Every structure is written in structure tokens, then in C-alpha cells.
Symmetry: C4
């Protein structure tokens, strides 16, 4: 059969560069003839030959008549959809995989696993699909919006790992990791460490033994919870990132949080899912991260790297590597993913750029992608080009 996927060394390169904008609403004018779906929480996951661009649709198109409610997050109509990366996600181009108001997906080398959560807030359900077949579920353990990554899960040797979490958005949300093989949960992993609130983890492989994730604390800190999951022992520990370049939004000024690495700090309440991807070299590991340019709003997006060290203990600033989205443009969730080239993996970050005109009109998103490419420095930014009044 195809053989199972493993992380490989990254393809050679030393800077990210603007790769692709998928801006569906450039075609949603009332006088045009297209039907872009109203979506949010996009992410991309790739298998050996193709990438799919996933998103959670409110099951409505622009132009159209169901804009009411599209700023909400959870309802009975939200579905996980995909298009091949490079296609515009329209009513006809999209595949509707399952009813879901939170999702993830990943390819294990042989088939796609799709993950979606739906159900009532106090009783939600993780649903897993392997190809066409619905294969397994996992129940709410804290009865308060069980939810998952909004980005790719990660498979190695056929075993796929997924972050899930449950609990109060302004309180405790202890995450768990599920180990999934061919659509079935074969193991629950309970992390150790600083565990009081971890959600929306962006995970990737640091090597064949470790998955690392930069996550969101929506309650206590502007530092990101950082998971190190050991794949050989199936154990996870979590501690806060110690860098002075806080990656959450909102956040205080860099370096202003005093005290040891684990200090929570100020402006911890609220948050945003953040980009994180690995560049695996033979002797050195690059960790690439994105954060909004505004400290308090979802506006702009800048790139940072750091090679080696230990995220849990290094307080050093990350090196700024370029403006992907200017302050003038929306920069909402971001996520990492890898494209498989013939012999190496290409790290990328994608950026959700939400068109927000509030609760009175449609609410949806463009997706911008930056990937490691060549050398020198990052050269250009992304605008969505959308005028919401059309």
C-alpha cells in the first residue's frame, strides 16, 4: 500500500516569502456571478501529492440572504469543507465533509483523517472520519465546549496526534491529546506541567520523537503554552514560552512581564490562535512564529524566528523576520503546515484575514500563505483587496 508518512528534513532555505493569496470574496459582489462560501477558521494540511484547504463554513454564500449569525461560532449548520489548495472555495468547488463548528484534519500517507466537533455546548462531541467512513467519537470531559485545534493534526508511522480541550473560556481548560490510528482513538494522553488553560494548539514535528505545539491561553496569560509531546512514550508536558516576545493578542509590551519564566503577567485574558512551524536541519532547529502587529487588535501579522535553545527557559527576544500583513489589514488566526516536496518538507505559515464589518453584515476570511523559500529577506506583504460594500 502507500507507505506511512514521517517528518523529513526541511528543504533548504532561510527566509519566508509571499506564496499565495486565496481571497474568495474578491468574487462576492452583488453584481457578480460567483458563490464564495462564508467561512472562518481556515487551515491547510498536505499529503504526499496535494494539499487541501479546509475551513468551517456557516453554509451560506456571498451574495446571499443568510448573513445573520455568521459572526457566531457555534450552531447547527456549520460544516467542515475543503477545496484542493489553489481553488476558490465556492458552493460547487467545495466538498462538505461533516457537521462541525471546530475542526482538524491530516493525511497519514495513505488516507485523510477529518475531525469535527459539534453537539450542544455542555455536551459536545469529537467525530472522526477516515476517508468516507465515520469511525469514532470522544465525549466532552469538562462539559464546556469541547473543541480542537483549527489546524492540521500530525501523523508519524500511521499514528496521528490531536490536541482537544474542554472547559471555561475564562477559567480552566485542561487539554488532552488523542492518539488516532486509521480513524480510531487508540490512546488518551494527559499532559503534565503548566496545564490550567491550553486551547487551539498549532502543532508540528520537531523531529521523529517530538511533536511541539504553540497554543493559546484565553484566560491567564499573553505568553503561549508550549507543549512538548514525546511520541515514543506518549507523554506530554506543557510550560509557558519564556521569550520576552509574547505571541498572544492581546499582550503587554515585550519584556514587561517580570519574575520567572512561568509568570503569567498582565493582559492575559483573551487570545488568538498563532502560527508556528518547524524548519528541521541536520544540526539546528528553526522555530518560526507569527503574531499580530497590534498588541491589542487582530491587525497586521509579523514573522519571528529562533534557532535552537529551549522555549521553556530562554527569555531572549525572537528575531523579527518581516511583515506579512501590514497594520492596515486584518490578521486573525494563523497556523503552520508543511508542503511535501520530492525529498524534503517545505514549512509554511498561513494567515486568516477576516473581513469583519460586525454583526450587521456577512463575516468571512481570505487565507494568505508564506513559505520558506530561498534566501535573503522577506519582501512583500498581503492585502485582501476586498471592499465589503460591494
Amino acid at each position: 500500500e502507500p507507505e506511512w508518512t514521517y517528518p523529513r528534513l526541511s528543504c533548504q532555505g532561510s527566509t519566508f516569502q509571499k506564496a499565495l493569496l486565496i481571497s474568495p470574496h474578491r468574487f462576492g459582489e452583488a453584481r457578480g456571478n460567483s458563490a464564495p462560501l462564508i467561512i472562518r477558521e481556515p487551515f491547510i494540511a498536505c499529503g504526499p501529492k496535494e494539499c487541501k484547504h479546509f475551513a468551517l463554513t456557516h453554509y451560506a454564500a456571498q451574495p446571499g440572504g443568510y448573513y445573520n449569525g455568521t459572526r457566531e461560532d457555534r450552531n447547527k449548520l456549520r460544516h467542515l469543507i475543503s477545496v484542493k489548495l489553489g481553488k476558490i472555495p465556492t458552493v460547487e468547488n467545495s466538498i462538505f465533509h461533516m457537521a462541525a463548528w471546530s475542526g482538524s484534519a491530516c493525511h497519514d500517507g495513505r488516507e485523510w483523517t477529518y475531525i469535527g466537533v459539534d453537539g450542544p455546548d455542555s455536551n459536545a462531541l469529537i467525530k472522526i472520519k477516515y476517508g468516507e467512513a465515520y469511525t469514532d467519537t470522544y465525549h466532552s470531559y469538562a462539559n464546556n465546549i469541547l473543541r480542537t485545534q483549527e489546524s492540521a493534526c500530525n501523523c508519524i508511522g500511521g499514528d496521528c496526534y490531536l490536541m482537544i480541550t474542554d472547559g471555561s473560556a475564562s477559567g480552566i481548560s485542561k487539554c488532552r491529546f488523542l492518539k488516532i490510528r486509521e480513524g480510531r482513538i487508540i490512546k488518551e494522553i494527559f499532559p503534565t506541567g503548566r496545564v490550567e488553560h491550553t486551547e487551539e494548539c498549532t502543532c508540528g514535528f520537531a523531529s521523529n520523537k517530538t511533536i511541539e505545539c504553540a497554543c493559546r491561553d484565553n484566560s491567564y496569560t499573553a505568553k503561549r503554552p508550549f507543549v512538548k509531546l514525546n511520541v515514543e512514550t506518549d507523554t506530554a508536558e506543557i510550560r509557558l514560552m519564556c521569550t520576552e516576545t509574547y505571541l498572544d493578542t492581546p499582550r503587554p509590551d515585550d519584556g514587561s512581564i517580570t519574575g520567572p519564566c512561568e509568570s503569567n503577567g498582565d493582559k492575559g485574558r483573551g487570545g488568538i490562535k498563532g502560527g508556528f512551524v518547524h524548519q528541521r536541519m541536520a544540526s539546528k532547529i528553526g522555530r518560526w512564529y507569527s503574531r499580530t502587529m497590534s498588541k491589542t487588535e487582530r491587525m497586521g501579522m509579523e514573522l519571528y524566528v529562533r534557532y535552537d535553545g529551549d522555549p521553556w527557559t530562554d527569555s531572549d527576544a525572537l528575531a523579527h523576520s518581516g511583515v506579512m500583513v501590514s497594520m492596515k489589514e486584518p490578521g486573525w488566526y494563523s497556523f503552520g503546515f508543511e508542503i511535501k516536496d520530492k525529498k524534503c518538507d517545505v514549512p509554511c505559515i498561513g494567515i486568516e484575514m477576516v473581513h469583519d464589518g460586525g454583526k450587521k453584515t456577512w463575516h468571512s476570511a481570505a487565507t494568505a500563505i508564506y513559505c520558506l523559500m530561498g534566501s535573503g529577506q522577506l519582501l512583500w506583504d498581503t492585502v485582501t483587496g476586498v471592499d465589503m460594500a460591494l
Copy 2:
């Protein structure tokens, strides 16, 4: 070349969950830009790698100008169409297979068999297509609307079995089974037993030896005719379901039909096609059924199960397993189908949710799917989200 398909044991699970909603008219607004087809009698059938979503279209789209007559069942324009399950059935996504105002289709492991009936009421015709080729036909034997299942036919080892019936909707309709191999009828099966009215059979494999069907008696009873068809001797016998949980609509109160299992009881006139699917375990058989929440109108839909026993002799109430569609939402025809996972089969029930605003506007349907998935209880219901005035 590909192996012939056989029924396998079902995948492990003990409850159904909400899987997917295909709701094409969420895109039919007169200010939108899409073309969902006007359809009724949807059903799904899967082969080893893919499922197709079939329906009978009135060869008209919403928005459009051909709404008049779309509530009627039989005319010269209806066609059997399909899209791959997960795509929205629009003008451009659909394949028009054949002219048909009643249909069925199944995959046998190597190719699709499509069945459609058309012709005048008094002298209609079963036409069979195998892949691209029209291959055989079967004539009306009672000259009163020859018609078939409106759901998947069933193949084992290259032989596909199909219910057909012919006769008065208010009187006698004796059904027959056809055994089809590579598109050509190789056998006609004349059932024994209680045969005065059987139509719209939903059938599946209880084992490699027996096909069972839960059917509609439109004249005499609210108990469903239940068929046991022995695939080895090609013989079939029919008797009424004895359970006090009557599955047809309209129906009397549960348990009010006194007398032996064969008493017809009251409010037998009228009916609805009902969902039915098997969960085949090594030692036991679960039979899952659906019926409307309302006793008299096509509103709501609830799930029921029974393990083992004999449907012909057990008067026991069936075990309620969850509300799939509430009473505020339409619940019209339902059907069972099975998805092929790698090593086991997944049972699902599909539900036609008709948007009915009477004869003065368009008339068409959404399809909701629930599949056996994990354990626990069924968690969420389905709404179409469609406003017919848009």
C-alpha cells in the same frame, strides 16, 4: 479485476450521531448565484471507495421559472441524477443518468447498476443501466404504476436484488423481487405470506444469507410489511412487523392495535418510506429504524433499535434512541445505507427533509445523515436552515 462486494460485519459502535447535512437550497436565494436542482426521493448508495447521493429531479433549479408541477410525482421530465456524496446537487455538479420518476441504484464491487421507471401510469417500465450501457427492462404486470424502492438496491457476489411493485395505492400491490447480474434480470422472485401491499422497501443484508426489508403498506396498515429474502434459495416471505412501536405515518398510538401480530389495525391508509439499517455483529444483529415524531404529519424523525429477536413475532416496543429531527422540522422519506470502511461496514440512516410550501411555490428537499459512531447517546438534531421566501 475488482472483487465482488459482500456484506461484512459492521464497525464497532453503539449509538448514531449527526454526520452531515446536504442542504442545497441554502444557496437557492433569488439574490444568490447558484443553481441547486429541485429534487425529491434522495437516497445514498456506496461502493468500496465512494458514495453517490441520488435523487429524482424535476429538471428545474431554484431560482428559476419551472416551479409549477414540482410537487407532482410523475411526468415526462423527471430524471435520476447523482453527485458524489458531499457535493451540492446543482445543475453543473449533477450527472443525469436516465429519465425516471422512481429509482434505485447499487454498486456491486465492479460497476454501478442504475434503475429508473418511467412510461405512462397504466403501462410503465423498469429500465436498467450498468455503467454507461442501457441493458434490460421489465414490464408492468398489474398496470398501475409499476415502481421501485427509492433507495439502494443490494448486491452480494455480483447479484443485486431489487424490490418492484405494481398495483393500486389504495388496494393491492403485490411486490416482486428482481435478481440482476451485470445489468440483466436473471431471476424474478415471487414472495409468499402477507403480500397484499408492499411498496417502497428499504432493504439491507442481515447476513450473507438474508436480505431484509422494512416496507410501506399504503392501504391496510401502519405496521410495516417486513421481507426476509433468502439469497441462497432465492425465495422471499413477507409478514407484518409485530412491534407495538408502529413505524408508518399515519399511525395509531403505540400498542393500540390489539390482536395477533397480523392484525392490521387502524389508520392504515397512507404511509411513508421508512429508514432501516443493520448492524451486524459476530453474535448479534441490531436493527435500526426511523419514524416521524408526528403520528400523522411528516414532521420530525426519531431513531429506534432492537437487537435480535424475530421482527415478525416480537410485539415488544423498540428502544428509542434519539431525536434526529425535531417536530418543527420536516421529516419525510428516510432510508438506510452503509459506508465501506477498510475492514468493516458503517450503518447510516438518511432523512429527506422536504421544503414544502404547497403547490404555489417550488418543492424540493435537503438530506440529513446519521451514522453509527462511538458510544453514548445521540447528541444533536438537524434543521435545514432554509427560508423558502428567499
Copy 3:
């Protein structure tokens, strides 16, 4: 490589039955959201696994703004297009093969040959395409609208035969047959016999040694020129069909043409391309033909068969086998084609049903298909269901 196609015995059956309507303009309402192409001269040709539905488009859609000129036949914008049979031929579904105002195509078992004619009236050009590649041309020999079949060419052992003709529409048009192998003309065949006007031949295989064609005489007779082409010697002879059931339109009453078989008769001027397909049995040959129900207008379409005999000498009436299109509906060009089933060939006739509101509005066509299917008699007719004012 795939092996070359040969004609096989026909699949068993004894009557034609309504198979499929492709009516694109059921979706062309000004208030709808679709783009059916404006087309005419449809035909279908099949290879081993699929059929394509071809047509000559005026390169315009309904609704739209280029209806002027769509009743003309020849201009600089007409193109040969195809969709997979069963799809609606819309702007997005269609493939544009080449610029052409007359066409043909056929599959030889390994690849598609496409044929289109364009160029000035007095100097037109046959262009041949094998797959994606343009491989050959043939020049006008009589300088007066070189043109070809408007239906499938026919391949045997890799050699594909095509009728072409050139000359006055109200005078002499001597046809030629080209023998084409992998897109290149390897032989010209000059027929013998009654040769003064032959155009729009509908050809098929009577066996592995003979191609027969029922053609159109636009100038001198309402009888059809009937070609017998010997594939082993690459020679052709033509004589008029002698049956009293004249197949052209316009035509005089049946049997009213006196004198020997080759007598031209009355009302010979004008004509229509006609359906003709073979049913090859081991000991008997059925020839199936269609003609309009009106003797003078393109309205209605009826089926006729005759088994064996010799079309050149038998004066016997053909046996009427059913009304495919009532007098009330358009019946314009018709054509034959065969669908390949696993072990036998299925004969069909398709009917162009043109929506004609004259020169002041759009002009386009639905395609109706009838195929040999089962036994008994033909049961239902086809309406397009199109209201041209919408």
C-alpha cells in the same frame, strides 16, 4: 496499449425505449443562475468506457447578449465542444476542441479523433485532431461549402472512415470518404453509383466488412442516398433507398413515387439529417431509422425498423415502431450511435429538438436519446419542457 475497437454483435433486445433527455435550456431563464451554451447539430460518439456529447456552439450562453446570428450556420466563432454524456453543456462543463461550423468525432479504442470544418464558403478546410494534437487537413475540392457528417465517424482496427462532401446545396454535391489512421488521412475513397447529391451521412457498421450510411439529398429527392462502403477494398457505391417509407423531410406521401427504385420523385428539394443505426445479430441485421412525423416540417419523430433485405432494391414499407417525439414538439436532425456494454454494443438514436423562435431570439437545441432496450413495444415520448419566453 489498449486494443483497437471493432463492431461486435448487438446486445439482446427488440424495441427502443426512452433513455435520456439533455435539455440545457431548462436552466436558461433570465432569473436563473446557469449558462447553457447555444448549440446546434448535437451528436454522441462513445469509446469503450464513456460517451461524449458533441455539438457546434455559437460561443454564446443563455441568458446573454449574443443571440444575434445564432440561427445562422457558418461564421468565425462557431466551435466544436463536448461534455461527458449526462452532463449539461454549460460554459464551465464544456471543452472547446476547435473552431468548426461542421463536425464529427469518433474513438478508435485508444484515442479520440475530432474533425471540424471552417474557413470561407468557397475555400473551406477539414481539420483533424488526434487527442490534443492537430494532425492533418483536407482542402475544398468543389469550392462550395466543404462540410461533413454532424455525427460520429467509425473506426475498425484503428482505421476511421469519414464522409465529407462539397458542392451546391441546390445542385451537385458529390461526397468522398476519407480513411484516417491516428489523425492522418491515409486514403481518399471516391464512391460510384448514384452520386449526384450526398451530404450529412449517418454511418455505422453492418458487419466488420461493411459500413452503411443513410444520407441526405438536399436537391433532387426525398429518398435517402444509401452508401455501402466495403472496408476490405475501400470502395464505396451509393444508390437511393427504394422503400416506399421516404425518410427525408420534406417528402411526398409514402408510396407515391412511381417508376424504378432510383426514381427521384417529387418534393425532393430541401432535406434533414436522419437517424440510422444497426442491430447486428448473428443471423439477421436490423436497420433502425427515424423520420419526422410531419411530411413537410421539422416536427415530431417516429421510429421504423426493417430486418435484412437490401435497401437498394426493397420497396417494402418499413415497420413503424413508435413515436419518439409527438407532432407538437420539434424533431430536427437525428443520428445513430452505439454505447459499448461489457460484451456487446447497444444501438441508440438521438434527436436534436431545436427551440426555434426565429431570427429575433436565441436558437438552440435539446438532445433526446432512445436506445434498444428489452422487449415489447416503445412506451413514451419526449418533450423538451422549455418555455422560450423565460
Copy 4:
């Protein structure tokens, strides 16, 4: 795995004929229902089985609201898109490959290499994609609009060659060639000879040893820079075409530039990308060229040929071979490409036909194709048929 592609001998033929018109804006009427993309700089490139039709879109459709700015060349929204040749480039049919305001692409027998340039004018960037993976980049060396061919690159044995140039449009632009293997630049080639301005090279194989290109000098001359690139030593030399039939636009009268082949002459300022393709015979090489009918405006397009000789030293007029587009119709960029028949290659020229109504309306283009086909003379011209007011 698939063999690497090499240039073969051309298929037999001696004249070009009209092959195909892709005219997407025949469907762009505000009362229609389609979404053709607004595009400029189309080109076509073929691999062994399929050709793709590429263009640079402004990420806007007709009808729509983003027409302003669609006449400008470089901005943050332009993307390289493709559709399979023969499909209309709409919103739903196109694949968005990468952000790019200048592009090229070629197939090497195993995979597609896509090249796009974006970034600010003073510091732009060549980005290369091989299949789905972003693989390499090349920096600006003269900091004045680094840019590439706007037509197919050329691969032999897995090595693909690409012209790039950087420099002032009014002065010096020294071009370079990149040698790319599986998406990564393995060699930079610095030409010799007359190198002061070479841009928009149309290149193809004269043999397995030489790539030749006919290019644009936008500052000094109306004679085209003509490149001979020796693929074995990876060296290139450039000299002006000596023919009195000057191929650029604007141009002086044919033969009015006196002096040696290298004299620049008059009306050198300005230019246009020109068509050029090879017909490789066993003993002789035909070089086919296109140029506008107008000497000063981008109207019309005519074909010219010359067999053998040396383009650098032959002052001979080229042989006129037919009017592909009359003077009433737009003739803007043109390019050559080759289709792969089974055993030989077919040369074609494509012509961009821009609908230009100035900066106050949409600006986009149709693509017309002429291919070597049979013998005789070129018979018909091409019109777009588009009314910009619709």
C-alpha cells in the same frame, strides 16, 4: 517513472491554420451568469498528455466591481492561474498557483515548474514552484523590475531553461538565463554579444543542442534580439535579427534601417512580445514568427516563415504566410508553443487579443491559436466577437 522530455522532429506540415479561440468575455455580459477572470499575458505550455493555458489575473471577474486598476501591470493581487487548454478561465475552473505579476511555466516530462515574479519594483523576486512545493527563488540584480518571459520555459532531459531580465525599460536591461532542475536553480548563464536590452524572450528548441529566442528590445531597436543558447556548454550569445522584416512594434518600414545587421535604426523605443516557434525537419529548420499588421499600434497579426540560414546575418525579407488577425481586431502579445503528438511535435503560435477600452473600464484578453496543419495556405482569420459594452 516517466521519461524526461526532449524536443522531437515536428509533425509533417507546411502551413498554419486556425485552430482554436478561447474568448472568455463572450460570457462576461452583465445579464449573463458566468465569471471569466480578468487576465493579461496568456501563454500555453504542454506536457506529454495535456496543455495548460496560463495567464496573469487581476483577481477579479467580469461582471464585477474591481475593474479599476486592471490596466496596470504590477500590484499585490496579481496571480499566475491556469486551466486545462480548451476550458474557459473562470473563477471556478482556474487554479491559482502563486502570487505573480510576471510568469512562465514548463513541463519536463515528470512535473510542472511554475515561475512567478512579485515584490516591489526596486527589489522583486523570481519564485519557483515544482508541483505543489515552493522550491527556490532568485534576487533582483539590477533593482529595476526583475521579470521573465510571459511564455513557456523549455526543458530537455530534466533541465529547464528560463530567461530573466532586470533593468530599465528605457535603457539597459541585461538578461540572464537560469537552468533549473526539479525546481532549483543549478546554473546562471550570462550571455555574450549584443546584450544591452533583451526582455520577454519567446524561446524554443532549434535542436537538442540549441535553444533560440526571439526577444523584445524596448529602448534601442525594432529589430528583435535573437538568442542562441547552447545547451551542452550552457553558454548563450545574443545579436539582433538582421531580416529587413522587423518584428517589433513600433517599427519603421521594412528595409529602411540601413547599415550592417547590428544597426539599431529608428522607432526602437517601445516594443511587444512576439511569437516564434520552430519546425524541426530532419534536414532543415523552419522558423515561424508573428508580428502585428499595424506598424505602430497593437492591431492585427500576420505569420512569416524562413527556412534555414542564420537569423543574425540574413537580411532577407521573411516570407509572408497569412493574416491570423485583421487590422480591425487587437493583436497584442504572441508566443510559440508545441503540442506533443504521439511521435512528433506540433508547432503553434498563440495570440493575446486584448479588449482595451482604456482605464475607465475592465481590461482583459482572449487567446487565439494557429498550429502547423497540412499544406496549402492559411485560410481564415480570428475575431474575438466581444462587445465591451455588454
